[PDB]
Design a protein around this ligand. Sequence first.
Ligand SMILES: O=C(O)CCC(=O)C(=O)O
Ligand SMILES: O=C(O)CCC(=O)C(=O)O
Ligand SMILES: [Fe+2]
Ligand SMILES: [Fe+2]
Lengths: 10, 10, 341, 341
Amino acid sequence: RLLEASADAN
Amino acid sequence: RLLEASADAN
Amino acid sequence: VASGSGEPREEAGALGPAWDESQLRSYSFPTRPIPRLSQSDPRAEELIENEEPVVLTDTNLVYPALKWDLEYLQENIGNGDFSVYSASTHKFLYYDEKKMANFQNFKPRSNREEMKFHEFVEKLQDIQQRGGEERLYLQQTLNDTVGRKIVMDFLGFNWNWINKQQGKRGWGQLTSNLLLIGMEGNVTPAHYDEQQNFFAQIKGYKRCILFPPDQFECLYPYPVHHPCDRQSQVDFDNPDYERFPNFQNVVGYETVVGPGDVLYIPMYWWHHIESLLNGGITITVNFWYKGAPTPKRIEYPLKAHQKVAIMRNIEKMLGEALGNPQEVGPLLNTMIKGRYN
Amino acid sequence: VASGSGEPREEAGALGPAWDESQLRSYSFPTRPIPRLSQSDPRAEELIENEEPVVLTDTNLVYPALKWDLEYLQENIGNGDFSVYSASTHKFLYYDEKKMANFQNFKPRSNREEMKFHEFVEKLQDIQQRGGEERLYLQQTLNDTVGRKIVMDFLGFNWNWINKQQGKRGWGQLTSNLLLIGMEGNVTPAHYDEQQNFFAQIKGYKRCILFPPDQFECLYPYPVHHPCDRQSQVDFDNPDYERFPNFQNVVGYETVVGPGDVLYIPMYWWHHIESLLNGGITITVNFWYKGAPTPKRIEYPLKAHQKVAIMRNIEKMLGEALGNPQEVGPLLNTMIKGRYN
Ligand SMILES: O=C(O)CCC(=O)C(=O)O
Ligand SMILES: O=C(O)CCC(=O)C(=O)O
Ligand SMILES: [Fe+2]
Ligand SMILES: [Fe+2]
């Protein structure tokens, strides 16, 4: 929930 | 959501 | 315009002033007076709607109980058990026992106990004569176990008026009525409640000091998972300005209520309540209503009480997510140190 | 045991050391070496599984590209547009343009631009001779627009190995392959990515300094809504210990990668990457994979990267709830001042 990650990179 | 209140009293 | 409760009201029949300054405790902050109005006055309805405090002098809310005193209560209040807090200081800091697990280094300053009304009245008379310093405060929700005389008084309350108030403000349901009987000088330290409250004074006088939701920064509530959740950490009698700097910017709204007065304490408003010194015992019955629901559409920016709702929620969520409320602080700090402060 | 990348490797055929200390920039922190292992070595598989960095020397991951150089690329890479960052300093701080709205006082230190490969190679040759100080870094996801020669090299990558890696770690899908070509001395300041990365060096050498997720407190990332979200606020060349005290406790894992090496950069691990000074241009192709999904059952206490996931989420939520990311800090502070710090 709050543990969920996204997926961003440079 | 985060705006939701509960209902506590002394 | 920071007088306080203003000039002590004069009792009808030239019975002298109801109380005098010397009965009020001394504090480091200024305060302005809460308005005293007739419930038929539009200004009062405007204050209730905009969620601001107001003392209503003629609601007849608890007309039938004005005759209540210990003797009469001992007589018809019933056989049930009454919660009674005891303390060696005038300050009755409230603590949620369910939360006492999360904090073991917490030592209660007042211990609760059950007893029959007659027993409370007795422990009370006992101290009174033996010249004791122990303090007592009976705080008990009114329920089925009460006598018929008491139930008749109860039915006699001005339900027509309050019910219309609940209707007008879209409030939720009346959750309870707390009967509070305390010794003069007793103090209930500043805290806020998550419900709308019509505070009905019955016997004795109580000085009420309220702070709006937007003074959250100056009052420093305990962490949500601490037993004193919602209570202010600042000792009003000896404020620690090093730990609580902004308490030097606090400003309260004050008033003294008496038999017949009804103080509207809006949801989230901080309130510090004290029974006048040498004013004898006090009696009050409050009416707690769940507040209205969150509007369909949120308007920006947010009101102070909404930001308070959010902070409590963030604290609650972090507590569950981390699997331990003791970790909330370290996480919060890690999150802001060198990033937001 | 805080040497760094260790003793400079010796090239086959007595071709001398690949590079020397004097090509490495100087920093205030100690570092220990990242292990260099054979992909057939169990210790390497143990590191990938436990999510720790490891340099694999013989994967043959991008065997076909080892022959790549500007000339060859200009030739067959295609006609597409290539993103190319320019800067007057060696530091290429990455900034999310979508987030440039939220912060107007932010002045980019490097500006992106599109161009054809031949144009990049040209602007590059142009500076090189005219003795310029301007810096360039081409960073472009590999797509359809590439030449068939390049597509053939691409198909030649060791998919059998990497695909099995993705399978073994339960990782998600390969999201992209970033082609990076930069001038010697160029620096990509410390930051972390939300994906698993197999970093394949092709031409030139790159010194890679990694910090584990648990050093979040010493690296001070920018606020989530800031353009430099995920980048460290600390200038490694002139660290401000007053604002960032804990940067004095930072310890990195370091290594120097060359043609043929593949550096596993685990998701959330900070990494600072630099092309050796006077090492000539560098070429690398990375492989970004979405990480595995959150386990069915959470085990406590939480791992460092999970706490980082939570902090980012709290910051994102507060940003939407308050209707403005600029309010996040004041709320966060109000929430902790005199309550959790
Ligand atoms: O009257 C008191 O002493 C406490 C009352 C109170 O906290 C309330 O009614 O919300
Ligand atoms: O090699 C570089 O300069 C940057 C690489 C990077 O940040 C990455 O692959 O995650
Ligand atoms: Fe209260
Ligand atoms: Fe990266």
